[PDB]
């Protein structure tokens, strides 16, 4: 037995050219502080877990 096989293929091709924007954000860290709650009496009652 003898099998000689030659195949020429055409392939899908996708070229993407990208120029990233200058000034993008890499990592953002934010510090927020809130106050207590002073009722009509004036006692600074702290907030709750849900809030």
């Amino acid at each position: 037995t003898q099998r000689n096989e030659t195949s020429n293929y055409e392939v899908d091709r996708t070229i993407r050219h990208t120029k990233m924007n200058v000034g993008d954000i890499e990592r953002l860290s934010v510090a927020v502080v809130v106050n207590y709650k002073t009722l009509a009496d004036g006692k600074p009652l702290p907030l709750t877990a849900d809030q």
Binding site: N4, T6, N8
Partner: protein, 123 residues
């Protein structure tokens, strides 16, 4: 090419003479093999067949080009041997000498045609 068409007939005749020469010499060499049949080719019919293909398409550079890759007639026996060998010395010796002569004649004709095509150009 037109140059091939002019020299096609003599080249095919020369190649067929070489092939038949090989076949006749194989018949001579295997003369003593018991059960060997003497084979030969009909020169004229095979010359018609050769004188009377599709390279695969190459889209780019990497694509690989297409890769390329006669009928033997039994001789009618003359004398019946006991070991089944039908090779006759005299017949194939004459055929061998004739094929040698015709190969030389084909070489002469092809060389003359090439030499004429050359002296047309020389100047």
């Amino acid at each position: 090419d037109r140059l091939d068409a002019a020299l096609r007939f003599q080249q095919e005749a020369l190649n067929l003479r070489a092939q038949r020469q090989e076949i006749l010499a194989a018949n001579i060499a295997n003369a003593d093999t018991p059960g060997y049949q003497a084979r030969d080719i009909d020169f004229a019919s095979e010359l018609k067949k050769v004188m009377v293909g599709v390279a695969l398409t190459l889209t780019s550079s990497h694509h690989i080009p297409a890769q390329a890759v006669v009928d033997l007639l039994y001789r009618v026996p003359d004398q019946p041997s006991l070991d089944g060998n039908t090779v006759d010395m005299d017949r194939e010796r004459t055929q061998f000498a004739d094929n040698s002569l015709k190969y030389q004649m084909g070489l002469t004709v092809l060389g003359s045609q090439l030499k004429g095509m050359m002296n047309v150009l020389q100047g």
